[PDB]
Amino acid sequence: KFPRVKNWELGSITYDTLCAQSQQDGPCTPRRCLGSLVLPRKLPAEQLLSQARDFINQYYSSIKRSGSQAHEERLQEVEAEVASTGTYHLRESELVFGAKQAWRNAPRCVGRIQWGKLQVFDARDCSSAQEMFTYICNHIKYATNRGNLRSAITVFPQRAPGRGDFRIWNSQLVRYAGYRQQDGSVRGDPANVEITELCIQHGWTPGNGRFDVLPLLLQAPDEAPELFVLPPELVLEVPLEHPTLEWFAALGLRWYALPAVSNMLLEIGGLEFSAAPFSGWYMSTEIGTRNLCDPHRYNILEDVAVCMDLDTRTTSSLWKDKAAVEINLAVLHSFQLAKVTIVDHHAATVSFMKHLDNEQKARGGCPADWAWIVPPISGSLTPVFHQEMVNYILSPAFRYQPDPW
Amino acid sequence: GPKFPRVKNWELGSITYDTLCAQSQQDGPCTPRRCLGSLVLPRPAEQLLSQARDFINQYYSSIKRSGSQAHEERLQEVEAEVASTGTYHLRESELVFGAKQAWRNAPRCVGRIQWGKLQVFDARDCSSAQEMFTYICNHIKYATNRGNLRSAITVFPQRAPGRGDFRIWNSQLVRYAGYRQQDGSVRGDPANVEITELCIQHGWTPGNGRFDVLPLLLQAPDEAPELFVLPPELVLEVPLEHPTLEWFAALGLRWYALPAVSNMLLEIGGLEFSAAPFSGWYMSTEIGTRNLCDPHRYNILEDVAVCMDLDTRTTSSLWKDKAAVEINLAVLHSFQLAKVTIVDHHAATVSFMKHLDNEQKARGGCPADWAWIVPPISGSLTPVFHQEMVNYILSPAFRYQPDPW
Ligand code: HEM
Ligand code: HEM
Ligand SMILES: Cc1cc(N)nc(CCc2cc(C#N)cc(CCc3cc(C)cc(N)n3)c2)c1
Ligand SMILES: Cc1cc(N)nc(CCc2cc(C#N)cc(CCc3cc(C)cc(N)n3)c2)c1
Ligand SMILES: C[C@H](O)[C@H](O)[C@H]1CNc2nc(N)[nH]c(=O)c2N1
Ligand SMILES: C[C@H](O)[C@H](O)[C@H]1CNc2nc(N)[nH]c(=O)c2N1
Ligand SMILES: [Zn+2]
Known part of the structure; x- marks a missing residue:
């Protein structure tokens, strides 16, 4: 039942017991693993009531007040509201707790060590x-x-039965x-x-x-x-320059400071927040590697390779790999020079390792999607490459x- | 849509459906509730006959004689042999087919475009x-x-009823x-x-x-x-040197030419070949990134960075990234110089995409383990990073x- 999880660099083993708390099916079956797919194929009072209760139970437990008067009364409020109206509403503090938890639960997020530090704006x-x-x-x-x-999130009004x-x-x-x-x-x-x-x-x-x-x-x-x-x-915004390459600045390259996702749904206790944009700060590989070097993005590798006068004729000269390194270095240098928060993929993955350990002690596990956690360059040079990870859906969740x- | 996994390439925007996975007879480690795809090792006459019948059906399909007298007589011959002895034996060309098919079926091998070209030494x-x-x-x-x-494999006698x-x-x-x-x-x-x-x-x-x-x-x-x-x-063996860094040859690093896995089980039609070593040629990242730079292997990243005069005290100089590239370039360069076959991670993953297309046409899919197919440096710089993959077990297999x- 409970998977044994091994780190291959250190030879240490944990057991994920937290996954027994998943209430939502992912895409894999015993016949075939679909863990590398980006999207799921996918895109009643009794059921809302039980997600509602489970989340309220989550919240009172978080403030150590499980079973107290306040807890029982709150469960009654939720039951009374659903029974009469088919829906309910969260208190601000409950929402605050839900948003942090949804971040904590996000399997694709390497920045989760920060999960407890989230400014929450109630835009309901x-x-x-x-x-x-x-x-x-x-x-x-x-x-x-x-x-x-x-880091921050702003939470617009929840979805409702009647309307758009x-x-x-x-x-x-x-x-x-x-x-x-x-x-x-x-x-x-x-x-x-x-x-x-x-x-x-x-x-x-x-x-x-x-x-x-x-x-x-x-x-x-x-x-x-x-x-x-x-x-x-x-x-x-941050103009990109290189510490040692004078011509790099000439490229006219730049990127914005604020990574702020705005198309995702925040689910808390059965309630759905279709507009709940959230932001932190960038890890440099997002800009330097994916946004600038993906062939379906700005695709700038060749230009940079030519500027570095590299042998483009053949893959064996590792020109792609050399230009990528400089582009990532330029992103780090530029953000640092402009005094804007950034984290490199080594620092980020090391702190994710600490987070894994904190979560093992706190919750008995941590949901993590290895393909998204491991950086898009220098994978095995980071500690997460060597870490087995169990992936599953916990609620509160971003979807x-x-x-x- | 079809009720088979839909598979997307996010670089080209192209779509396929894996129908091959329908042929899978063995469960892997995932369930609807949690994905275990990142784990390295996750976990009777009637059963033998049934695996044997299936393999013999594969064999006769492959020679386009499915349904024939020769096909049904072989079936008969196989069950008679299990009836009287508990085991059976493969014909020579059956072993050759099954060996190739086991390579073809290996989800972790990026080298599978070569699968049709395998010298099979019979050592039964x-x-x-x-x-x-x-x-x-x-x-x-x-x-x-x-x-x-x-490429080659040598097959020694199969496991026997209570014989070592x-x-x-x-x-x-x-x-x-x-x-x-x-x-x-x-x-x-x-x-x-x-x-x-x-x-x-x-x-x-x-x-x-x-x-x-x-x-x-x-x-x-x-x-x-x-x-x-x-x-x-x-x-x-190949002594390692660098095309332009003259001091790299002084490190006295070297690697051997021939990667030959010798501890795997080759399973064909229920028969188990416990000794059946097989060899190919290296992809350069196996040597220059994993074998030399893994912290738990030769661990030479720091030494090489010191020689390169990098700032090894801060993650954000990308010292690890720069050293790794140079060690990888040195592996490619030294092998080329020594006329010993090797393939870089760009050429290998490109060839694997071509293999994906061939197999889509030929079998309707290709079992592939994304975490192992994606190289351990320059991940998203290779086309496989952007390719979704479905992972499942087909037989014949290496286990x-x-x-x-
Ligand atoms: C504080 C700094 C943070 C860092 C460095 C960080 C790092 C990252 C990275 C590198 C990714 C993969 C993104 C990609 O490849 O496009 C990611 C994904 C994600 N993060 Fe964070 N994160 C941070 C804060 C946050 C916050 C505040 C939230 C929400 C409250 C969050 C929730 C998520 C979610 C839901 C994903 C998956 C996005 C998707 O599926 O497209 N993260 N994070
Ligand atoms: C022809 C050149 C070949 C290349 C470039 C190649 C490439 C690779 C690579 C890079 C890996 C991952 C290795 C690791 O990370 O340790 C691998 C795994 C594997 N390959 Fe190949 N391969 C080749 C030929 C072969 C042959 C001839 C066979 C067997 C007939 C084979 C069967 C396997 C199997 C079973 C694995 C998984 C082994 C494991 O789990 O440890 N490959 N291949
Ligand atoms: C808070 C935060 C901090 C930080 N450093 N990085 C992030 C991730 C950013 C991200 C943005 C987009 C977009 N647009 C898509 C993605 C995922 C790619 C994708 C692609 C598609 C087609 C759909 C979809 N939902 N997602 C990630 C967030
Ligand atoms: C034919 C061929 C060509 C080629 N280019 N590469 C290979 C496979 C390389 C490989 C070797 C070993 C070993 N030893 C272990 C592995 C797996 C890593 C591993 C490591 C450990 C410690 C245990 C375990 N079960 N598995 C892979 C084969
Ligand atoms: C197909 C594959 O799953 C896809 O390219 C994923 C791989 N890993 C990723 N990891 C992160 N952080 N972000 C991504 O967009 C992706 N893309
Ligand atoms: C934890 C993780 O599954 C493990 O480190 C895997 C990742 N990908 C790999 N990929 C290859 N080719 N070889 C490996 O040994 C590994 N190790
Ligand atoms: Zn899976």
């Missing part, structure tokens, strides 16, 4: 796209903090436009072609740069989404949800 | 440990072929000694401390270098294992088996 009294914009701006300002980045969802259409709060050219290519970020086109269509005046910050498309229930331009002074269009 | 007549030695030496000579390496197994105690045909020092460190390869100490226990006179080739501990049915030293002239001691 939001009634318009306009109000959503104000809240999003205050989040960005708080989170950014002149480069001294602070509150949604942020953009996948992140800051995204660069991707412009489909005649010549079939893309100018800017190819990942954001579809969102750039939705923006233009809803009336945005596009640019023609490689790094034009997109406007937000915000949707109040059952209304057309609305367009809002982020004030340039709120979007902190993927359909695109609104 | 072997009857002593001395003869095992002769066969093994012939394998190495043929496979090594003065540096122009050729043929076993090769060593994990590979070529391994360096690991000597546990009286200060607690290890000289040589720490992976091989146990087998080194079994070797000495059985009367081997040990050396004291970092790169002493171990002797072979060969076990014939019901006999204690016997010890055989490989004649040095049969063990091709792990308990250590003989």
Whole structure:
């Protein structure tokens, strides 16, 4: 039942007992493992009531008050509310606890050592796209903090039986436009072609740069989404230069400070928050490796290799591997110079190892998706490569949800 | 959609469905409730007949004679043989097919584009440990072929009803000694401390270098294992140097040419071949990244970085990343110089994508273990990182088996 989990570098073993608490099926079966798939194929009062209770039980236990008067009364409130209305509402403190727990539970997140330090903005009294914009701006300002980045989440109104969802259409709060050219290519970020086109269509005046910050498309229930331009002074950006390579700065490369996911659903106690954007700070491989070097992203390896005068003719010269290292170094150097928070993949994975150990003591296990935890360069050079990991779904949870269009 | 796993490549945006996984008869370690794909080792006449019938059906399909008199007579011959004796025997071309099929089925091997090109040495007549030695030496000579390496496998007699197994105690045909020092460190390869100490226990006179080739501990049915030293002239080795860093040759690093796994079980139609070593050629990251840079192996990252004058006191200089690239380049360069076959991780993973496409057409899928297929440096720089993979067990197969001691 309970899996033995081994670290191969140190030869140590733990047993994951926490997985017995999963109530939600992942994609694998005994016949075949599907653990490497990015998305699940997937994309009543009795059932809401029991997730509700389980979460309230979670919360009172967290404040050591299991079984107290306050606990029993709270379970009664929840039961009374569901029975009469088919739904219920969380108290602010309960929400706060749920958001941290959803982060704690996120198997794909290597930054979870930070999970206890999360500023939570209650935006549940939001009634318009306009109000959503104000809240999003205050989040960005708080989170950014002149480069001294602070983790945060802002929670818009939950989904309801009657009506359309509150949604942020953009996948992140800051995204660069991707412009489909005649010549079939893309100018800017190819990942954001579809969102750039939705923006233009809803009336945005596009640019023609490689790094034009997109406007937000915000949707109040059952209304057309609305367009809002982020004030340039709120979007902190970092020009990329290299400590020793003078020509690198010439490339004109840059990236934003704030990684803020905005298309994911936050589930707490059976309740669903379809708009609940959250941010921390970047690990440098996200920018240096994936965003700049993925062949379907900015795909800049070749340009850099040529600048370094490397032998591009053959894979055996490891030109790809050499240019990648310098691009990652440029990202770290630049963020450090500009006094904006960043973590390298060695420091991050070492702290994830400490987190694994903390969670083993605290909860008897830690859900983790090895393919997402291990960095996209220098995998086996980090300690997580050598760590077996068990993957499963615990609730509170961040989930993927359909695109609104 | 089809009710088979949908599989996506996130670089090209292309989709396939794995229908091959339907043929899987053995459960792996995952369940709906938790994924265990990252674990290295996760965990009767009627049963034999049924595996035998299935393998014979595979054989006759492969020669396009499924349904024929020859097919049903072979079936008849197999069940008669199990009826009277409890076991059965494969024809020669049946063994050749099954050996190739087991390589083809190996989810952890990125080298599978070559699967059709395997020299199968039949050693099912072997009857002593001395003869095992002769066969093994012939394998190495043929496979090594003065540096122009050729894939091969040698098959020794299968497990018999209450008769002892043929076993090769060593994990590979070529391994360096690991000597546990009286200060607690290890000289040589720490992976091989146990087998080194079994070797000495059985009367081997040990050396004291970092790169002493171990002797072979060969076990014939019901006999204690016997010890055989490989004649040095049969063990091709490559001294490591760097194309531009002149001091790298002074490190006195080296590696052997021939990777030959010798502790795996080859299972075909229920029959179990406990000694059946097989060899290919190396992918460079196995040597330059894992074998040399793993903390629990040669661990040379720090030494190399010091020679390169890197800042080894801060993670954010990427000192580990820069040293690893250079050690990897040195492995490729030294092998090329010495005319000994090797393949870099770019060329290997590209060829594996081609293999994925061939197998989609030929069998409707390909079992693949993402954590093992993705190379341990430059992960997302290779096309396999962006390819979803389905993992399941098909037979014939190579399986792990308990250590003989
Ligand atoms: C504090 C600094 C943080 C760091 C360095 C960090 C690090 C990372 C990294 C490297 C990834 C993989 C991302 C990718 O490949 O695109 C990730 C994923 C993720 N993180 Fe974090 N994280 C941080 C904070 C947070 C916070 C505050 C939350 C939510 C409260 C969070 C929840 C998640 C989730 C749900 C994923 C999976 C995203 C997806 O499926 O697309 N993380 N994290
Ligand atoms: C032709 C050149 C070949 C290349 C480049 C190659 C490449 C590799 C690599 C890089 C691995 C992972 C090794 C590790 O991380 O320790 C591997 C594993 C494996 N390969 Fe190959 N391979 C080749 C030929 C073969 C052959 C000839 C066979 C058997 C007939 C084979 C069967 C296997 C098996 C069973 C594994 C998994 C072994 C384990 O779990 O330890 N491969 N291969
Ligand atoms: C808080 C935080 C901090 C930090 N340092 N990094 C992150 C991860 C960022 C991330 C952004 C996007 C986007 N857009 C997609 C991903 C995953 C890729 C993806 C791709 C697709 C197609 C859908 C989907 N839901 N996700 C990750 C978050
Ligand atoms: C034919 C061929 C070609 C090629 N390029 N590479 C290989 C496989 C390499 C490999 C070797 C060993 C060993 N010894 C162990 C492994 C597995 C790692 C391992 C390590 C330990 C300690 C235990 C265990 N069960 N498994 C892999 C084969
Ligand atoms: C197909 C494969 O699962 C996919 O490329 C994953 C691999 N690992 C990852 N890991 C992280 N952190 N982020 C990613 O986007 C991915 N992509
Ligand atoms: C814990 C993890 O499964 C383990 O370190 C795996 C990861 N991927 C690997 N991939 C290959 N090719 N070889 C290995 O030994 C490993 N080790
Ligand atoms: Zn799985």
